[PDB]
Amino acid sequence: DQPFAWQVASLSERYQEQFDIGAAVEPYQLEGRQAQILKHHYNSLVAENAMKPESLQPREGEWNWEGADKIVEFARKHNMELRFHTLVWHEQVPEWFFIDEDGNRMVDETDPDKREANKQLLLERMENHIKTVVERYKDDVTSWDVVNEVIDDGGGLRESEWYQITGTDYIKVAFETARKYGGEEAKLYINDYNTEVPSKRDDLYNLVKDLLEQGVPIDGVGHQSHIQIGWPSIEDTRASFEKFTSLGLDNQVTELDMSLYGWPPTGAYTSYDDIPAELLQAQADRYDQLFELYEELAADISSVTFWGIADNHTWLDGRAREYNNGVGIDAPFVFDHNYRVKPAYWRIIDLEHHHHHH
Numbered sequence: 001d002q003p004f005a006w007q008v009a010s011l012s013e014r015y016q017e018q019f020d021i022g023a024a025v026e027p028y029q030l031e032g033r034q035a036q037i038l039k040h041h042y043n044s045l046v047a048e049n050a051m052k053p054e055s056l057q058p059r060e061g062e063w064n065w066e067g068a069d070k071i072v073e074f075a076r077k078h079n080m081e082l083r084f085h086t087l088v089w090h091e092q093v094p095e096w097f098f099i100d101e102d103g104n105r106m107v108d109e110t111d112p113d114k115r116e117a118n119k120q121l122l123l124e125r126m127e128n129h130i131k132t133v134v135e136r137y138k139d140d141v142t143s144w145d146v147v148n149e150v151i152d153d154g155g156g157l158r159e160s161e162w163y164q165i166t167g168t169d170y171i172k173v174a175f176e177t178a179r180k181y182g183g184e185e186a187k188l189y190i191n192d193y194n195t196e197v198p199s200k201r202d203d204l205y206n207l208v209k210d211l212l213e214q215g216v217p218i219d220g221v222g223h224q225s226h227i228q229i230g231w232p233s234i235e236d237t238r239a240s241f242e243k244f245t246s247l248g249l250d251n252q253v254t255e256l257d258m259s260l261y262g263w264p265p266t267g268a269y270t271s272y273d274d275i276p277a278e279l280l281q282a283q284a285d286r287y288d289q290l291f292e293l294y295e296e297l298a299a300d301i302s303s304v305t306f307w308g309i310a311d312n313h314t315w316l317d318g319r320a321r322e323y324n325n326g327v328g329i330d331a332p333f334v335f336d337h338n339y340r341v342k343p344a345y346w347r348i349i350d351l352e353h354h355h356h357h358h
């Protein structure tokens with residue numbers, strides 16, 4: 001049987017002078033074996049859920065800091081950089097933001113003058129959310145996901161409530177507000193998934209380039225990297241990183257996981273013991289090529305964060321159940337559900353450098 005994660009060489013050490021290695025965490029994972037693995041292998045953290053808008057301010061003026069603070073305290077004690085997920089997002093956002101002072105839904109307003117009043121009220125609420133969070137955590141966060149998933153998969157901007165009420169101004173104001181209270185030293189990111197898809201990559205590039213030309217402070221791009229064993233291509237990943245580097249932007253890989261399945265994750269395995277060894281080998285081959293690319297582009301990438309620690313906790317389990325009538329698991333990491341190393345661990349810890357020509 002493979003050794004446990006706490007018995008093998010550190011991932012973060014292996015990528016010194018290349019990029020930090022991070023994990024998404026819940027506060028209840030900051031003890032026992034999961035905390036031991038974090039300290040041994042990772043030098044950067046992000047809150048999986050405790051810092052989302054609905055977690056921090058579920059009602060106006062009701063602040064829920066405890067879980068977020070525990071993650072900050074862990075990052076302080078163990079010398080881990082900390083990313084912030086996330087200041088502004090169309091998911092996991094409390095409904096009160098988009099309700100006017102009469103209890104009406106701003107998105108349904110038809111009077112042009114009340115629409116403008118709603119836009120200013122919503123922006124003030126967004127500004128106050130950002131101000132309060134950034135003032136609390138400024139000296140503990142080194143990468144802010146200021147806005148998340150603002151590009152539509154079908155082209156153009158996502159027509160969320162934020163966009164419906166404020167246009168693109170919520171994006172401009174969010175970055176300006178984060179800069180104002182974070183100071184010039186704060187590093188401000190726009191985060192998204194499928195950034196490797198050329199059409200979406202290009203929409204994100206055009207948005208950021210236009211905003212930079214207006215003086216909006218944007219320092220980098222977060223690539224969620226919710227990927228598969230056979231998709232997206234290394235070539236498309238490379239092109240995406242380089243396109244944002246061409247604007248003077250940092251790149252971070254922010255939510256890396258490699259599903260066993262395609263999309264949708266139909267036909268998922270219902271137990272880890274049913275996963276064929278050849279599939280874990282294919283995952284290992286792909287992770288090898290992926291981290292070889294990251295090494296190639298290490299000047300362009302400051303950190304690579306996995307959206308979890310080991311296979312026993314991943315949002316991909318819930319996704320598998322969604323498309324398989326409530327049953328199914330996924331195994332996206334280099335540490336398996338019992339914290340034992342997987343073939344992918346060996347393939348991204350090693351110093352292999354013989355290339356894979358065909």
Ligand SMILES: [Ca+2]
Pocket residue numbers: 271274
């Ligand atoms: Ca079975």
Ligand SMILES: [Ca+2]
Pocket residue numbers: 017018019298299300301302303
């Ligand atoms: Ca780097």
Ligand SMILES: [Ca+2]
Pocket residue numbers: 311312313314317329330331332337
């Ligand atoms: Ca799992």
Ligand SMILES: [Ca+2]
Pocket residue numbers: 288291292346347348349350351352
């Ligand atoms: Ca390797």
Ligand code: NI
Pocket residue numbers: 020043044081
């Ligand atoms: Ni670092």
Ligand code: NI
Pocket residue numbers: 288289292352353354355356
């Ligand atoms: Ni290789």
